[PDB]
Amino acid sequence: LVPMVVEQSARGERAYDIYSRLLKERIIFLVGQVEDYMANLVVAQLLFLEAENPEKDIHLYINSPGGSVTAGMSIYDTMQFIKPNVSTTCIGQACSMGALLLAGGAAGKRYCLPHSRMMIHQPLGGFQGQASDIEIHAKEILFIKERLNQILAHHTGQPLDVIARDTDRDRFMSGDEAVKYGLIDKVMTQR
Amino acid sequence: LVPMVVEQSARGERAYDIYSRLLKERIIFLVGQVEDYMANLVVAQLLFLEAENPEKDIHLYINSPGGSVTAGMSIYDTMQFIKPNVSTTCIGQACSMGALLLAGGAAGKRYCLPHSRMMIHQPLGGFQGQASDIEIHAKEILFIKERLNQILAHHTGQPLDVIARDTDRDRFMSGDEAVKYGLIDKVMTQR
Amino acid sequence: LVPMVVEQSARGERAYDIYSRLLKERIIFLVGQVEDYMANLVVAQLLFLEAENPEKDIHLYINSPGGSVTAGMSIYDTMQFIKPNVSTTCIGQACSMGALLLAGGAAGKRYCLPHSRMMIHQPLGGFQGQASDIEIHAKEILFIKERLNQILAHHTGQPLDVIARDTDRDRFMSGDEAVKYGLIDKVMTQR
Amino acid sequence: KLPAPKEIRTILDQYVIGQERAKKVLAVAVYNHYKRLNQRDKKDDIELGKSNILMIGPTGSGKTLLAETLARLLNVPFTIADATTLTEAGYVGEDVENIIQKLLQKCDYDVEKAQMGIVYIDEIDKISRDVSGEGVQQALLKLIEGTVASVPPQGGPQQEFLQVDTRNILFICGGAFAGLERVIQNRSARGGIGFNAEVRSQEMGKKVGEAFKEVEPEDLVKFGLIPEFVGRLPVIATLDELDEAALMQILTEPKNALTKQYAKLFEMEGVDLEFRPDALKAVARKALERKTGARGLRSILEGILLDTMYEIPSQQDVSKVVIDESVIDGSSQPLMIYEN
Ligand SMILES: Nc1ncnc2c1ncn2[C@@H]1O[C@H](COP(=O)(O)OP(=O)(O)O)[C@@H](O)[C@H]1O
Ligand SMILES: [Mg+2]
């Protein structure tokens, strides 16, 4: 069960859920497998916070093992499209679709915990059909792969060829390794 | 069903669930298998209580048979990052992941009931794929095993070699045994 | 469906479910198989009532065919730790954990309805694995069996040799037989 | 008569320890206010509107002291009326008229003195957001800007009621707005929760150090005060929290310092009251945890002095009573030179 909290504002006492109370402070939670339904909620949250104050920063915690590529792209594109800077703080694990959002945060506002693990691998796809259909889908997934590599190269700053070789196979990076790679900027240890 | 409760405060009467009422006292409950969804609630709860009173201690009851290593790490890393002391009072059982959180509590504030069983076991992992993937996924489960051994040695104070030897097989430790081992600070019996 | 109840207090009218209304009078219900989730509710209820009135007695009604040993121990250890005397009233069945929690009530406050049935048997366990693992778990289930017998002897006053002999096989005891055995103190018949 | 703002500041500084920001504001505020009562000539310059002040500071910051101390510099009728007692008409409770009534009792029922009076309505924050809320604010609005008095006669018909216009009196308002720090925190760096958040330093008298410096009308409206009400009070003074550094500088520095007063009483019998630097600091910490601040020093000190204050008179030849840090806590007793 989700616990309930009380704001106890000057106006009066109001009951907010644990997630909504944090949402008031510009905090969005990305948990579980990525999909269209959960991703749209993150998109809606980002758009709502945008109108409140386009200047203030938005925090986005990411603990997810991946999911739909299209769903994640909507979040990444939305973060860049909006004016406020979307900070990212990886907690737990960060898979390919997970690490493409963590690296999409504003420079200097990307963080991770000491025991966090970040993984990056090629996009996974599947389809059944005729030879002509397979050739069409094969080009689409291959084209999508180039875009993801370019995105990481832009934020990380590493060469595009290096990104492709590392993403060819599963590669786990710790907090210290990620900073040198360019995925993040600082590893939080204590307040 | 979760029974409701009334605080009967001076400002007025509000209805709080049994779990929410205790949350106001800086108390968090960890029940069931550890997973991303349940663990994220503990993260939000720990962070939320930090703002209300970053000086008052927090009591985290642990009764769980284990679960996701990544989910647990987000809790442990969060407890150490925040300033308040996070007390631990093991009730029931504390398996491999549960024991790690019990040992991660503040010094001198780790407790357990008399009929409490604290088990320690290696991390559980499963993966299928080519030999290259197996070799890549074997270093990760072996590297994680080293991090968990260092964490126990740091809090318990025992040498790393002893932790690896004990974690090789399931080892059940009662309240008294756990005190000598360093996993806890005191065994409470009566108020 | 759970019915609603109105307290009609002097301050004003309030609506509480049938279970919450009884909780106000320091009454806790234990129904169904004992498990970590439902057991945690009882623990929370016991602590909450303690803060409201640490001197007034508490009444715990037990109707369960047994369940998890760990979950039961968390309740038993909590009942003894708190200051108020937790009464116990059997309302028809206690197979393994119900009698341990019925016999773990304050002296002179263990009751049973006229046609209730109470049983006591050794804890059942299930595990699979290597021979070394089986030997480790076998010792654990043998240690638990001894600790449970010691608890009954303490509250019932019977020697340990008799408890172990009676727990080898399922033994049914009526209300009158239980009083002589020492499991309970009085049999409530009429008001 | 019309003393320079700087002189007022120095006089008020004698007791107040570290309210410079508000000190100047309060100084200029009254200075111009009385200049209006002074500048009554008919040269098309009577239109001047008064500007009421809105003092916001944590309880015990020194708000009341400033109002009271300044009242003495004016040497005219002053009063402090709580806001909680007041309730909108139509329900039992004090009526807005009563404020003028009690205010006039201090004035001796003199119209000239009334117009030249100052008010210090306290706990204004209480009336925020059908009854005891906007109603009271609406009624008060007219009163603070412009209203005629209806104070019934004292001692001794209905026409006997007296009148005076509430357009000269400076209605200062002091209030401990609990929660305003969160409203001002939302202005910039709203983050309360999270790793990269602005999580409060502590739950002691450090929290509001300069949190009210950035107080704007919008926040006060969000707090619950009517927009019109916030507009009525253009000036918003800000006070500090009187933390341990302040309390150490307030136990000996002020002209009315408890140590001085206690020393005077002790000096009569012939005991030279002495205090240790760490000793005074110890009391400050004890007061902060107790949450009694200013008001906790006297009590705390009485618990550490009264004990030996009942002995000292019966003892002779006493020359000094050294108060050690240990003495402040419950470990030792006041060291005393029983003989010379
Ligand atoms: N700097 C100071 N010097 C001397 N006394 C002070 C000081 N600050 C507060 N006090 C004392 O605290 C008391 C409380 O008044 P004040 O702090 O103005 O607001 P409140 O009455 O709401 O606490 C006053 O009686 C005053 O004597
Ligand atoms: Mg005062």
UniProtKB/TrEMBL annotation, chains A, B, C:
User: What does the record give as EC number?
Assistant: 3.4.21.92
Reactions catalysed, as given in the entry: Hydrolysis of proteins to small peptides in the presence of ATP and magnesium. alpha-casein is the usual test substrate. In the absence of ATP, only oligopeptides shorter than five residues are hydrolyzed (such as succinyl-Leu-Tyr-|-NHMec, and Leu-Tyr-Leu-|-Tyr-Trp, in which cleavage of the -Tyr-|-Leu- and -Tyr-|-Trp bonds also occurs)
* InterPro entries linked: ClpP, ClpP/crotonase-like_dom_sf, ClpP/TepA, ClpP_His_AS, ClpP_Ser_AS
Which GO molecular function annotations are given, in alphabetical order? Answer: ATP-dependent peptidase activity; ATPase binding; serine-type endopeptidase activity
The family database entries (Pfam families) matched by this protein are listed as:
CLP_protease
Q: One GO biological process from the UniProt record?
A: protein quality control for misfolded or incompletely synthesized proteins
- Determine the domain of life of the protein's source: Bacteria
The entry's active site is S96, H121
Cell compartment(s), UniProt: Cytoplasm
Q: Which GO terms describe its cellular component?
A: cytoplasm; endopeptidase Clp complex
Q: Which UniProt keywords apply?
A: Cytoplasm, Hydrolase, Protease, Serine protease
Task of the protein: Cleaves peptides in various proteins in a process that requires ATP hydrolysis. Has a chymotrypsin-like activity. Plays a major role in the degradation of misfolded proteins.
Subunit (UniProt): Fourteen ClpP subunits assemble into 2 heptameric rings which stack back to back to give a disk-like structure with a central cavity, resembling the structure of eukaryotic proteasomes.
Family as reported in the entry's similarity comment? Belongs to the peptidase S14 family.
What is the protein's given name?
Answer: ATP-dependent Clp protease proteolytic subunit
- Species for this entry: Pseudomonas aeruginosa
From TrEMBL, chain D:
Named from the GO MF annotations, one term is: zinc ion binding
Q: Name one GO cellular component term.
A: HslUV protease complex
Tell whether Nucleotide-binding is among the UniProt keywords: yes
Q: Where does ATP bind?
A: P58, T59, G60, S61, G62, K63, T64, L65
Respond yes or no to whether keyword Protein transport is given for this record.
no
Q: What's an example GO BP annotation here?
A: cell division
- Report keywords, A-Z: ATP-binding, Chaperone, Metal-binding, Nucleotide-binding, Zinc
Q: What does this protein do?
A: ATP-dependent specificity component of the Clp protease. It directs the protease to specific substrates. Can perform chaperone functions in the absence of ClpP.
Q: Spell out the subunit comment.
A: Component of the ClpX-ClpP complex. Forms a hexameric ring that, in the presence of ATP, binds to fourteen ClpP subunits assembled into a disk-like structure with a central cavity, resembling the structure of eukaryotic proteasomes.
Homology family:
Belongs to the ClpX chaperone family.
Q: What is this protein called?
A: ATP-dependent Clp protease ATP-binding subunit ClpX
> Per the UniProt entry, what species is this protein from, by scientific name?
Pseudomonas aeruginosa
Q: Which lineage is the organism of this entry classified under, starting from the top rank? A: Bacteria, Pseudomonadati, Pseudomonadota, Gammaproteobacteria, Pseudomonadales
Question: Its encoding gene is what?
Answer: clpX
